[PDB]
Amino acid sequence: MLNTCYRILGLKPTVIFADQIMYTGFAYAARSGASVGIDDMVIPEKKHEIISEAEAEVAEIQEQFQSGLVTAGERYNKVIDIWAAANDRVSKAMMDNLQTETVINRDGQEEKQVSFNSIYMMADSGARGSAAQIRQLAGMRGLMAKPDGSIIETPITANFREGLNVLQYFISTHGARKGLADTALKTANSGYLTRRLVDVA
Amino acid sequence: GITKASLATESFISAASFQETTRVLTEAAVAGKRDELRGLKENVIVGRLIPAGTGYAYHQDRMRRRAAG
Amino acid sequence: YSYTEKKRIRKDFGKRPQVLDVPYLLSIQLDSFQKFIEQDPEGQYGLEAAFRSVFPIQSYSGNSELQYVSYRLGEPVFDVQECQIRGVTYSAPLRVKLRLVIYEREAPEGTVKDIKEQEVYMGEIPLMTDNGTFVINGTERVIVSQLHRSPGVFFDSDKGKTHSSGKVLYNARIIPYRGSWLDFEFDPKDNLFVRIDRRRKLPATIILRALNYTTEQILDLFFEKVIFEIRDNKLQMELVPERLRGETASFDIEANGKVYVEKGRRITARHIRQLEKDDVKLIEVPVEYIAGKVVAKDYIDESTGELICAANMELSLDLLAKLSQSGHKRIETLFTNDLDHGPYISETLRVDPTNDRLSALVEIYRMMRPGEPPTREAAESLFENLFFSEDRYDLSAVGRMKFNRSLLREEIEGSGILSKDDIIDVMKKLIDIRNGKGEVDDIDHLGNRRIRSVGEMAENQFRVGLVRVERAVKERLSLGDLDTLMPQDMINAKPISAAVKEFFGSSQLSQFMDQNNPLSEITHKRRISALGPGGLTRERAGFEVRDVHPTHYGRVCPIETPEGPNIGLINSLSVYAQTNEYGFLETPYRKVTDGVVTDEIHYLSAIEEGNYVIAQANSNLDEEGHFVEDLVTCRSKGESSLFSRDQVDYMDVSTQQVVSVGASLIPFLEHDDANRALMGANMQRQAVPTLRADKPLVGTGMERAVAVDSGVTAVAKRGGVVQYVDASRIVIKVNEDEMYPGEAGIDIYNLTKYTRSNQNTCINQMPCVSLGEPVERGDVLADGPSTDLGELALGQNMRVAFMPWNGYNFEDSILVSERVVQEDRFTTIHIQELACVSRDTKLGPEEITADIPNVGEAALSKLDESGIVYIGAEVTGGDILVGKVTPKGETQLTPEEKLLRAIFGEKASDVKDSSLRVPNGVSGTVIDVQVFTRDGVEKDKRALEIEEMQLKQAKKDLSEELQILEAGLFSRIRAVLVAGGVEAEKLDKLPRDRWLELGLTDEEKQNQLEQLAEQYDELKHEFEKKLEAKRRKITQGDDLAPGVLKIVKVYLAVKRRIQPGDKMAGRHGNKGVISKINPIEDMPYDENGTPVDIVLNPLGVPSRMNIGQILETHLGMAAKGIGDKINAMLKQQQEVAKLREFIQRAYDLGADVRQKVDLSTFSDEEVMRLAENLRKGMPIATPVFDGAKEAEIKELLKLGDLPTSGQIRLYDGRTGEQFERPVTVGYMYMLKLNHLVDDKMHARSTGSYSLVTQQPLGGKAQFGGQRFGEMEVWALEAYGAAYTLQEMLTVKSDDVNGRTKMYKNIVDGNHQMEPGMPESFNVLLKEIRSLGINIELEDE
Amino acid sequence: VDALLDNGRRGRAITGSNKRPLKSLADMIKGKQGRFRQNLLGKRVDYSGRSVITVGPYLRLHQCGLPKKMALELFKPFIYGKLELRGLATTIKAAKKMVEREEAVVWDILDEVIREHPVLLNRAPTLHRLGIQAFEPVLIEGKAIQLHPLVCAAYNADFDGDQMAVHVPLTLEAQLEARALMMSTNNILSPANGEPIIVPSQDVVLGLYYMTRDCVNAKGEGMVLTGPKEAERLYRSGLASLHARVKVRIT
Amino acid sequence: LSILAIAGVEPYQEKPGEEYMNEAQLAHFRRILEAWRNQLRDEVDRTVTHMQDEAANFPDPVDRAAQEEEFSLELRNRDRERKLIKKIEKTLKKVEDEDFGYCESCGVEIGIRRLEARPTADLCIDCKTLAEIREKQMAG
Ligand SMILES: Nc1nc2c(ncn2[C@@H]2O[C@H](COP(=O)(O)OP(=O)(O)O)[C@@H](OP(=O)(O)OP(=O)(O)O)[C@H]2O)c(=O)[nH]1
Ligand SMILES: [Mg+2]
Ligand SMILES: [Zn+2]
């Protein structure tokens, strides 16, 4: 919207327009009283089900490993897939529940529309957080990998609205530290790259 | 390559900024090299108007006064 | 339940029982130091240990030996308090007994004379505080425990990136505690090399020759022998039935009258089963199989006595004939197999330029010190000194242990230096791994990383102190005359005291205590660093060591680590962690014998722990303590899986033991993204202490452990009753049980009052008991800064509500109601120390006189006749604290100044105005003045008033002790006289001083009165001497630096409120910079009318996955609910019944907890006092992984009469209309960190300029301008900003001429610049021109 | 001589009594990297300062909130001039004493020299040309810098306690340079990709979204209104719901 | 197994006198292999759309490390899937070449029911297990 204003009216009007957007957006945002409480982070009703299914899927590939149907190195990447899938099921489960399930009526019978749940309004608009991060609040938060890089064959089954336990947090540790370590260097790498580029231009 | 291309610069003053300084001067002092500024780096070193932007006007207007009368 | 627990009890959720309570958190610092400084009647590490190494010292074989007797530690010159104000280091004099013996020439081991010189002094060595810190110059410092590679030998890889071939490599490294490194490494060609330290590579076999091993013994040692017999004509061979594995038949191979295998069929399990079972020892062979084999020993021709073949020379079908015709029946050969036993050492010998012992010993000397000629005596001694000298080499015990451990020996202790066997045994084991048997170590595993701390690290600095004094003692013992010099003439003080002052003064491990916070201190003293001496460097390693390793579980905290250029290079000690006997890291566990979980605890080091299978913290066991489930989640060998009920050998002690003290203080941590958790316990330590010590409504349970173990608080030595309570001191009349027999008396605790911290904050103790209250031993007696009632309160919680407020919380910025700054509650008190120095300059001495040239009486009002500002004066910027003048004569003024002096008649003085004035912008009250004056300069007026007042004050303090201590002591005398002679009324009529005479009939009660007498008369005299030294210390000349006459130190107490710019954050890594301070009129309020203190932005919560801050807010809300309930019932004065009925309900909540509570507590006087402390809110505890769960949280909202949502409706204070949607409100404990705005904010128009480069420089604390670095210049280049750039690096900085021409133009109202050339480049022109380079400016 | 010119291309002559090697002529030019003087940083600079940054949503996009205290010290030579131009000071030495006294008369003078005099704002890692931008200063009681929220995107500034520096365009050229090239409103488009970089960030979009959104049934359902002007009248007074389906006349 | 689910394929069932590797069997594994391949192609393709949105929005210095952590897990996995697809493609070549169902080390035949779990299996349990043992010894 701001873009088209520029290419039609010119610099000056776009500038003062953009002011009006900020002033008003802030004002009505305050009137809205949008917030976030514990009950805003709605877990799917099916979560515990989805786990036990892919958890039994590992019980299949386990039976085959002990009974020699499948090999050992094979079995690691088999289980890691049936877990990696269930996470995509849990993710698009909460996202179906959270998105539209405010079911409300107009004079006649029943109808459903995009939810007005607090934490949802934030992501759909783009103000902050993404289904990726949301996936760690309501649904389980992915699989982590040990310092190796080799992603561990029993994912973090808990989310942030629930607790994590001893081990789950300790597994979450590596990715966080390498995260910090990397972005400390990924800052240096940008810096060096841009430096080299201006020297030649 | 970008890193190699930059290493070759006409102005010897520019090179002693980011290259290895000892080597740059020696190579240049034997050659009797005359630096005319012209580039950006060197004009900042010597603290006069950048030969671009607002300064382009001045440097252009003065560069022509040279090689002339 | 105790006495300061009865006052206020934190409601604790969480089910898992505490089985082991947190040990002393300062264990590491205090323990380690105690071992170093202590008489140990044996060798174990200490000052005794260090001594015994270098000693006995003996002169250059002159049989004049100086041996070491014993050592003593003198009393502290000043105690802790004394030493701090003045600025000395807290040290004790080291007195060591030395014995100088002389042997006659040549007296058969016996002495002409020996002088047994009493304890010579060798410097003072610093001492550690009660709380694990040092004082270096009146400033508390901490010595960070270090993490370095354990001594011993370690086999490593270096796979891949090497050469772009893959291949991998294998290397062994022997790293001793002291002495040179011994490295063994391979290469692609599979040649063994050695290099000492990181020096020039050399062929490995050279060291064998240096130990007097020739070529034959080198072959003999590392290889087997294949014996070849010449029996009849042509070759037989001794066959080991195993040797043929991994090879194929070489010819028609037959034996025992049956061809087992023919030419071309690989020798497998069939053939080896045949050979082994049929016992084939000798077989006949062709003369061509030895064409390649290498001969073992030396073989010469028996007739001509000439050399046929040298050892380690390969034979040929022709070479055999030369030693066959010479009559040789044996030829010993090497067994070479490039899978099993590789021909490695053989090839090495062919690369070795040496042959004999002295050949190699030379090649070693010339490698270490090239360029200078070798000598016979040099190469042998040098090498013998490298790995075999007790003095210049030691592995220690840990080194010797890991050495024997890693090599699969039995002995756990032996030589401290390497032996001929040791080195060989290592070379053997290294070969094995390359062969495929054995695996390599990794540096990262916490069994190969060792922890040192102050006690050990100080040992090394004393040892180096002695080795540099040893040369000096040996040097003097060379020429020394008979009985004239004595063992004090030689030993200097400076060499010893400097080598130790160096460490504690400036070292990467000695730093200014991070002391803004009882957590900051305790988290600092429990800290690790892999930097500095003997560890890695930031530019070396290397992500493997920085990353969190599985072995960190329960030893090092995974989350509390710095956020900067060295992440993971620091870390923090875990709660329950402790240092191994050997110096490793161990953690507590529970011994699971069969299927029951015991309570006998075991400490398991990193290596020990791997083997066992340890259960998990959260595991349900009931009745006898059987595991409830048939399968329990456990972790064993580095990984984690489900396990059988009876397979678990141990179990985690607590749910907490994995984190640090910092990390454990976050509630609902389990619910917080790991990233934000780091920042939480990272910023928590930066919490500046508040005016009013609050208390966290939402807690974890740890706050009591941190408060006590950190020194800031005053903890009761002995249990008793309070006699006297003053804001100054507290006197405890001790109970009978704990009180010692003699001296009786009372414990008197003198409180620390208002004083400067390392970070300019204020540290103040306050009394937390009232007159005549019972306290027991180990009770909390007085709160520190940022501690309440015994709990650690780093901040103050307040009513917080999440919602956009017209953008005044746009990013993480915070919006605060005026009610907060009005309540002065996040107001924060800082204390700076400003000093004035009277020096001596070439022109003359500086005077502290109050006569200051060209100042009005407005200035000289706050200054007394002597020239010092009065105590108590509220002063602001510009006012003079200490008048001072420096000699500057003959000013040489100019005409218009001269004419000006003549028009207004000022007597242009010969002295400059140098007075100490108050820095612009900061403003506070003077609360103390100290004056230190050179010994022998007359104490001025005010100085004598001060040193007289310190005298009068010191007398009152000491006598108060005696008055309280007498009555305490006399009160016991009264009670022992009553047991067999009780004359209650008769006794106390006569003067109490006239009691000591009364005896007792034959009984021990007669000897008890005798005890108090002894200790009475000692109180009489110990009073006298404590008063004497105190008095001398005040009047004695204060010693200063050279050139300085006298110094005035003024201490300011500035009271800073809170304003936009201050960084604040909750415990969950939610930073934010207070943005506007709003009227209470404009605040969001609820239907009850109660405004809200802070309005936080909901956007900061989803992205940053810190969900505990929300849980905290809700639980806090319910916790305030219980407050409002009790507050209503307490104001209703309902009576004990209705109150106790309600309190009892609160402390249970739902079922299954660990809490327990009344009605035991005395149903009146005690129950009422509790209620008061709760009306502000009810303190709850959410343990780290044992926390409360939503149901219990929602349940407490019901009792608090608050919605389960945690949300209510609010009304905009401005428009008064409702806010659509419910918003969350609650209470979040919040910290104000010390990035306070009015410390960061700097500005400069024109200021001081650096001499070398005429460049804006902070000189008068009007700080240097901002640095305008390379990147900021590219900014201007992308715009056209040609002039903006010139002015930026011309007149605004470097152009000495331009800046004034400009400034004059600015005030003249002409915006121009007259730039010219920057001096930075003008100096380059000169700097270049002073090299051989002719650099000119051409043309025009 | 060689240790004097470039020490290190020998055996490394050490300085007297001091283990450290002594810095030679070559080492006085050389460094890390090259000429120290031209390397970051980079030369300190008069007329400058810094502190923590905060918000201020009330700003127009072409201005910024500058602490009273800072602006006083920064423009010090300008105030001394304007003070004696209008005759409030007899001489510069008097003007010096006046602003030191913080006489209330000066605040009104400061606002004169401040009006059309841009300043430059710069935040930590200067990445693109938008890392420095020029604003018109508005005096603030307080010690924090107020930063218009829309430029926060370009700076990659949050408010977790980040600090920014200020620089005063002294010369007449620098004012007109800072106004026609570096001014906020002249650079609203990224030079990397023609799209706006002054896009609304987060809080402000959550605002508009909730506003121009609809629910199935709420106050105001289905009524009709003359125009936008009276549509606000309907909402502000609580007659209509913000999100209700409605036909209105628009132009 | 969601692998068998992705295709509309059901576990096979060797009948009494059914010849070993016949037309119907190779048609069976082809559907599974293409469907498994088609599913993997969708995972690499989808992932990227989320990946392109996060990299465009600039995180706050504080959440760069937390945002990056989720990116690294995805990246590593994708390269494994690319390997998996290349292994499937390699296995898809064995069907067309009529050399599917037997151990690559020894001529022994690999189980039918064994191939339905992981159609990309190259060795029998004996040779495969022995290989993993050599691995731990030749590596560490
Ligand atoms: N997570 C996962 N990986 C798969 C999958 N399919 C194939 N791979 C990768 O292929 C490799 C293992 O398969 P193979 O090449 O047949 O070798 P292997 O089974 O004998 O170990 C591994 O490579 P690698 O990752 O480079 O090493 P590694 O995993 O063996 O440690 C593995 O990650 C899969 O579905 N999921
Ligand atoms: Mg920031
Ligand atoms: Zn096989």
mmCIF file of C-alpha atoms in Angstrom, chain C residues 804-813 920-922 1059-1063 1071-1076 1097-1100 1104 1215 1217 1220-1221 1235-1238 1240-1247 1249 1255-1258 1262-1276 1278-1285 1287-1289 1291-1294 1299 1302-1303 1306-1308 1311-1313 1320 1324 1327-1328 1330-1332, chain D residues 5 25-26 28-29 35 37-58 67 69-70 73-78 80-82 84 92 102 117 120 122-126 128-133 141-144 146 149-150 152 157-163 165-175 177-178 181-182 187 201-204 206 210 235-236 242-243:
data_model
loop_
_atom_site.group_PDB
_atom_site.id
_atom_site.type_symbol
_atom_site.label_atom_id
_atom_site.label_comp_id
_atom_site.label_asym_id
_atom_site.label_seq_id
_atom_site.Cartn_x
_atom_site.Cartn_y
_atom_site.Cartn_z
ATOM 1 C CA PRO C 804 0.121 -2.137 23.307
ATOM 2 C CA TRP C 805 -0.003 1.328 24.855
ATOM 3 C CA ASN C 806 0.004 3.800 21.933
ATOM 4 C CA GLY C 807 3.449 2.553 20.913
ATOM 5 C CA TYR C 808 5.398 3.552 24.052
ATOM 6 C CA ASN C 809 6.435 -0.093 24.128
ATOM 7 C CA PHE C 810 7.299 -0.406 20.427
ATOM 8 C CA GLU C 811 10.181 -2.861 20.480
ATOM 9 C CA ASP C 812 10.919 -4.079 23.986
ATOM 10 C CA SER C 813 10.799 -0.565 25.469
ATOM 11 C CA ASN C 920 29.244 18.145 35.553
ATOM 12 C CA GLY C 921 25.790 16.574 35.781
ATOM 13 C CA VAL C 922 26.310 14.302 38.800
ATOM 14 C CA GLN C 1059 14.380 7.954 34.043
ATOM 15 C CA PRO C 1060 14.099 7.095 30.341
ATOM 16 C CA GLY C 1061 17.214 5.223 29.224
ATOM 17 C CA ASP C 1062 17.697 2.770 32.081
ATOM 18 C CA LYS C 1063 17.868 -0.870 31.026
ATOM 19 C CA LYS C 1071 15.099 -6.595 28.147
ATOM 20 C CA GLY C 1072 13.620 -3.138 27.788
ATOM 21 C CA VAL C 1073 14.451 0.554 28.068
ATOM 22 C CA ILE C 1074 11.953 2.625 30.029
ATOM 23 C CA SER C 1075 10.492 4.956 27.445
ATOM 24 C CA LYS C 1076 8.028 7.353 29.038
ATOM 25 C CA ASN C 1097 4.257 -5.242 24.890
ATOM 26 C CA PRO C 1098 2.673 -8.616 24.005
ATOM 27 C CA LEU C 1099 4.759 -8.883 20.820
ATOM 28 C CA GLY C 1100 7.971 -9.541 22.734
ATOM 29 C CA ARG C 1104 11.297 -14.766 21.873
ATOM 30 C CA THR C 1215 -10.448 8.190 27.390
ATOM 31 C CA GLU C 1217 -13.507 3.720 27.846
ATOM 32 C CA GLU C 1220 -11.764 -4.522 24.027
ATOM 33 C CA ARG C 1221 -10.665 -8.075 24.876
ATOM 34 C CA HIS C 1235 23.311 0.399 32.109
ATOM 35 C CA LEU C 1236 21.656 3.427 33.660
ATOM 36 C CA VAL C 1237 21.244 6.282 31.234
ATOM 37 C CA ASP C 1238 23.080 8.948 33.169
ATOM 38 C CA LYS C 1240 26.125 6.093 29.272
ATOM 39 C CA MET C 1241 25.187 9.612 28.146
ATOM 40 C CA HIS C 1242 28.225 11.600 26.968
ATOM 41 C CA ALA C 1243 28.574 14.765 24.927
ATOM 42 C CA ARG C 1244 31.386 17.063 23.840
ATOM 43 C CA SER C 1245 31.501 20.272 21.792
ATOM 44 C CA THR C 1246 35.207 21.127 22.081
ATOM 45 C CA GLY C 1247 37.320 19.458 24.722
ATOM 46 C CA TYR C 1249 42.912 16.901 22.545
ATOM 47 C CA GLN C 1255 42.303 14.261 18.405
ATOM 48 C CA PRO C 1256 39.318 14.760 20.767
ATOM 49 C CA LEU C 1257 40.207 12.914 23.964
ATOM 50 C CA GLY C 1258 38.533 12.378 27.313
ATOM 51 C CA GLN C 1262 34.198 15.447 29.408
ATOM 52 C CA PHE C 1263 34.669 12.440 27.310
ATOM 53 C CA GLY C 1264 36.185 12.083 23.897
ATOM 54 C CA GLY C 1265 33.814 12.461 21.021
ATOM 55 C CA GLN C 1266 32.442 9.390 19.334
ATOM 56 C CA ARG C 1267 34.881 7.462 17.207
ATOM 57 C CA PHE C 1268 34.006 7.801 13.527
ATOM 58 C CA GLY C 1269 35.449 4.590 12.219
ATOM 59 C CA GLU C 1270 35.915 3.167 8.763
ATOM 60 C CA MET C 1271 32.337 1.945 8.305
ATOM 61 C CA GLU C 1272 30.818 5.296 9.258
ATOM 62 C CA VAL C 1273 32.851 6.932 6.461
ATOM 63 C CA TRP C 1274 31.457 4.631 3.756
ATOM 64 C CA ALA C 1275 28.091 5.919 4.931
ATOM 65 C CA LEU C 1276 28.948 9.455 3.843
ATOM 66 C CA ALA C 1278 27.219 6.564 -0.399
ATOM 67 C CA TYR C 1279 25.508 9.900 -0.022
ATOM 68 C CA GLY C 1280 27.149 12.790 -1.804
ATOM 69 C CA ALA C 1281 28.201 14.127 1.565
ATOM 70 C CA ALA C 1282 31.524 15.553 0.406
ATOM 71 C CA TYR C 1283 31.693 18.511 2.775
ATOM 72 C CA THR C 1284 30.129 16.671 5.701
ATOM 73 C CA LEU C 1285 32.996 14.201 5.369
ATOM 74 C CA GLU C 1287 34.636 18.690 8.131
ATOM 75 C CA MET C 1288 34.267 15.335 9.912
ATOM 76 C CA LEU C 1289 37.959 14.371 9.581
ATOM 77 C CA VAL C 1291 38.081 20.645 11.532
ATOM 78 C CA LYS C 1292 36.081 18.357 13.844
ATOM 79 C CA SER C 1293 39.164 16.367 14.805
ATOM 80 C CA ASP C 1294 42.611 16.295 13.263
ATOM 81 C CA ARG C 1299 39.303 23.775 14.455
ATOM 82 C CA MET C 1302 36.131 27.270 12.483
ATOM 83 C CA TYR C 1303 35.089 27.789 16.102
ATOM 84 C CA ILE C 1306 30.894 29.700 14.316
ATOM 85 C CA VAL C 1307 30.561 32.367 16.982
ATOM 86 C CA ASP C 1308 31.095 35.088 14.375
ATOM 87 C CA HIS C 1311 29.286 28.797 8.630
ATOM 88 C CA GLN C 1312 32.365 27.983 6.546
ATOM 89 C CA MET C 1313 35.404 25.800 6.865
ATOM 90 C CA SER C 1320 47.358 12.768 11.079
ATOM 91 C CA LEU C 1324 52.644 10.424 8.109
ATOM 92 C CA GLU C 1327 57.012 9.609 9.520
ATOM 93 C CA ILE C 1328 57.585 8.539 5.912
ATOM 94 C CA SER C 1330 62.163 10.005 8.280
ATOM 95 C CA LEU C 1331 62.449 6.660 6.581
ATOM 96 C CA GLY C 1332 64.599 6.685 3.472
ATOM 97 C CA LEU D 5 63.435 0.929 10.651
ATOM 98 C CA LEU D 25 59.194 3.368 12.308
ATOM 99 C CA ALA D 26 57.599 0.752 10.077
ATOM 100 C CA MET D 28 54.287 3.140 13.433
ATOM 101 C CA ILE D 29 52.665 3.109 10.005
ATOM 102 C CA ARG D 35 47.644 2.718 8.507
ATOM 103 C CA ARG D 37 44.950 6.405 11.355
ATOM 104 C CA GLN D 38 42.760 5.353 8.408
ATOM 105 C CA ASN D 39 41.719 2.051 10.015
ATOM 106 C CA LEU D 40 38.550 1.856 12.112
ATOM 107 C CA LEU D 41 38.599 3.758 14.310
ATOM 108 C CA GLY D 42 38.966 6.007 12.562
ATOM 109 C CA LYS D 43 39.501 9.269 14.475
ATOM 110 C CA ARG D 44 37.433 10.685 17.329
ATOM 111 C CA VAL D 45 35.339 13.703 16.431
ATOM 112 C CA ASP D 46 34.276 16.952 18.114
ATOM 113 C CA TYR D 47 30.610 17.948 18.434
ATOM 114 C CA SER D 48 29.322 14.462 19.216
ATOM 115 C CA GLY D 49 27.966 12.234 21.941
ATOM 116 C CA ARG D 50 25.754 9.249 22.611
ATOM 117 C CA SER D 51 23.396 7.520 25.019
ATOM 118 C CA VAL D 52 20.724 4.827 25.221
ATOM 119 C CA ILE D 53 17.841 5.085 22.736
ATOM 120 C CA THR D 54 14.104 4.916 23.399
ATOM 121 C CA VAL D 55 10.912 5.326 21.379
ATOM 122 C CA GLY D 56 8.712 8.395 20.895
ATOM 123 C CA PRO D 57 5.807 7.395 18.615
ATOM 124 C CA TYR D 58 4.575 11.004 18.624
ATOM 125 C CA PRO D 67 17.929 15.565 25.280
ATOM 126 C CA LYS D 69 21.324 18.398 28.287
ATOM 127 C CA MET D 70 22.948 17.040 25.125
ATOM 128 C CA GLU D 73 26.700 20.903 25.196
ATOM 129 C CA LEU D 74 26.650 20.054 21.498
ATOM 130 C CA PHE D 75 25.729 23.445 20.051
ATOM 131 C CA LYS D 76 27.821 25.370 22.595
ATOM 132 C CA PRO D 77 29.616 27.607 20.033
ATOM 133 C CA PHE D 78 26.303 28.285 18.286
ATOM 134 C CA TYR D 80 27.478 31.730 22.417
ATOM 135 C CA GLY D 81 26.980 33.349 18.996
ATOM 136 C CA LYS D 82 23.210 33.689 18.971
ATOM 137 C CA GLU D 84 25.471 37.889 21.729
ATOM 138 C CA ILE D 92 31.703 35.782 24.571
ATOM 139 C CA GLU D 102 21.603 27.726 32.621
ATOM 140 C CA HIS D 117 19.677 22.753 11.677
ATOM 141 C CA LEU D 120 22.921 13.085 12.122
ATOM 142 C CA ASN D 122 23.979 6.763 13.733
ATOM 143 C CA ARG D 123 23.491 3.321 15.301
ATOM 144 C CA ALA D 124 26.048 0.566 16.135
ATOM 145 C CA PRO D 125 27.127 -1.550 13.030
ATOM 146 C CA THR D 126 26.900 0.938 10.137
ATOM 147 C CA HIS D 128 24.154 0.585 4.594
ATOM 148 C CA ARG D 129 23.922 4.316 3.901
ATOM 149 C CA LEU D 130 20.680 4.301 5.942
ATOM 150 C CA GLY D 131 22.801 3.581 9.041
ATOM 151 C CA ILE D 132 23.280 7.328 9.323
ATOM 152 C CA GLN D 133 20.145 9.447 8.800
ATOM 153 C CA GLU D 141 13.568 16.758 29.301
ATOM 154 C CA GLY D 142 15.448 13.523 29.937
ATOM 155 C CA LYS D 143 18.761 11.841 29.084
ATOM 156 C CA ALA D 144 17.588 9.424 26.368
ATOM 157 C CA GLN D 146 14.029 9.471 20.999
ATOM 158 C CA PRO D 149 9.896 3.962 15.064
ATOM 159 C CA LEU D 150 9.784 3.559 11.263
ATOM 160 C CA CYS D 152 14.208 1.415 13.410
ATOM 161 C CA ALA D 157 17.725 -1.226 16.093
ATOM 162 C CA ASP D 158 15.712 -2.707 18.902
ATOM 163 C CA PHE D 159 15.329 -1.090 22.325
ATOM 164 C CA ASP D 160 17.016 -3.696 24.576
ATOM 165 C CA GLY D 161 19.331 -0.891 25.655
ATOM 166 C CA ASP D 162 21.114 -0.048 22.398
ATOM 167 C CA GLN D 163 22.895 3.297 22.219
ATOM 168 C CA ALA D 165 25.761 8.495 18.509
ATOM 169 C CA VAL D 166 25.058 12.056 17.378
ATOM 170 C CA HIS D 167 27.048 14.318 15.042
ATOM 171 C CA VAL D 168 26.387 18.015 14.357
ATOM 172 C CA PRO D 169 26.612 19.203 10.719
ATOM 173 C CA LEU D 170 28.707 22.311 11.300
ATOM 174 C CA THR D 171 29.320 24.024 7.958
ATOM 175 C CA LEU D 172 26.497 25.507 5.883
ATOM 176 C CA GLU D 173 27.256 22.880 3.255
ATOM 177 C CA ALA D 174 26.863 20.072 5.781
ATOM 178 C CA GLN D 175 23.401 21.314 6.757
ATOM 179 C CA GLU D 177 24.079 18.161 2.517
ATOM 180 C CA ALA D 178 22.399 16.500 5.499
ATOM 181 C CA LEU D 181 20.834 13.610 0.945
ATOM 182 C CA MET D 182 20.802 12.248 4.484
ATOM 183 C CA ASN D 187 15.642 8.187 1.899
ATOM 184 C CA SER D 201 7.228 -2.642 11.815
ATOM 185 C CA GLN D 202 5.209 -4.714 14.298
ATOM 186 C CA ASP D 203 3.064 -2.903 16.907
ATOM 187 C CA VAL D 204 1.747 -0.635 14.170
ATOM 188 C CA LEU D 206 -1.076 -5.418 14.692
ATOM 189 C CA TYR D 210 -7.359 -5.783 14.028
ATOM 190 C CA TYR D 235 -17.284 3.974 16.642
ATOM 191 C CA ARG D 236 -15.716 6.522 19.019
ATOM 192 C CA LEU D 242 -14.824 -1.712 14.923
ATOM 193 C CA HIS D 243 -15.323 -4.891 12.869
#
